[PDB]
DNA sequence: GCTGGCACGACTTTTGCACTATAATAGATCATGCTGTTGCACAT
């Protein structure tokens, strides 16, 4: 907030916790072989 | 006859060659890109 943000908005700095989006058809895939790494690998056909 | 600016034979000055243990000091963030090390995923 405040206005170390008009600078922040114009610098196009990535936020700490970005939100991921999807594509044309996000069908259900949950996660195939969700190992100890990043789990729930979404694979919408 | 008296005087005041010009040259000459020693002396004097200039110039290239030329080689030569102790200590000011540390109190911003903030972001970005690169490098090295480690852990996750696949293969015979």
PDB file of N, CA and C in Angstrom, chain A residues 9 13 15 20 26 35 38 40 43:
ATOM      1  N   UNK A   9       4.266  -0.605  -9.134  1.00  0.00           N
ATOM      2  CA  UNK A   9       3.407  -1.008 -10.242  1.00  0.00           C
ATOM      3  C   UNK A   9       4.075  -0.748 -11.587  1.00  0.00           C
ATOM      4  N   UNK A  13       7.163  -5.333 -10.888  1.00  0.00           N
ATOM      5  CA  UNK A  13       7.852  -6.268 -10.010  1.00  0.00           C
ATOM      6  C   UNK A  13       6.909  -7.398  -9.620  1.00  0.00           C
ATOM      7  N   UNK A  15       5.032 -10.195  -7.531  1.00  0.00           N
ATOM      8  CA  UNK A  15       4.690 -10.297  -6.106  1.00  0.00           C
ATOM      9  C   UNK A  15       5.328 -11.507  -5.445  1.00  0.00           C
ATOM     10  N   UNK A  20      -1.221 -18.678 -10.041  1.00  0.00           N
ATOM     11  CA  UNK A  20      -1.089 -19.364 -11.321  1.00  0.00           C
ATOM     12  C   UNK A  20      -2.459 -19.453 -11.977  1.00  0.00           C
ATOM     13  N   UNK A  26      -9.350 -26.476 -18.783  1.00  0.00           N
ATOM     14  CA  UNK A  26      -8.749 -27.008 -17.575  1.00  0.00           C
ATOM     15  C   UNK A  26      -9.491 -28.196 -16.995  1.00  0.00           C
ATOM     16  N   UNK A  35       5.123 -36.620  -6.077  1.00  0.00           N
ATOM     17  CA  UNK A  35       6.244 -37.017  -5.236  1.00  0.00           C
ATOM     18  C   UNK A  35       6.525 -35.932  -4.195  1.00  0.00           C
ATOM     19  N   UNK A  38       7.100 -30.540  -5.880  1.00  0.00           N
ATOM     20  CA  UNK A  38       5.813 -29.903  -6.136  1.00  0.00           C
ATOM     21  C   UNK A  38       4.772 -30.940  -6.534  1.00  0.00           C
ATOM     22  N   UNK A  40       0.654 -32.567  -6.959  1.00  0.00           N
ATOM     23  CA  UNK A  40      -0.569 -32.267  -7.702  1.00  0.00           C
ATOM     24  C   UNK A  40      -0.250 -31.669  -9.074  1.00  0.00           C
ATOM     25  N   UNK A  43      -2.624 -31.857 -15.275  1.00  0.00           N
ATOM     26  CA  UNK A  43      -2.446 -32.183 -16.689  1.00  0.00           C
ATOM     27  C   UNK A  43      -3.803 -32.167 -17.384  1.00  0.00           C
TER      28      UNK A  43
END
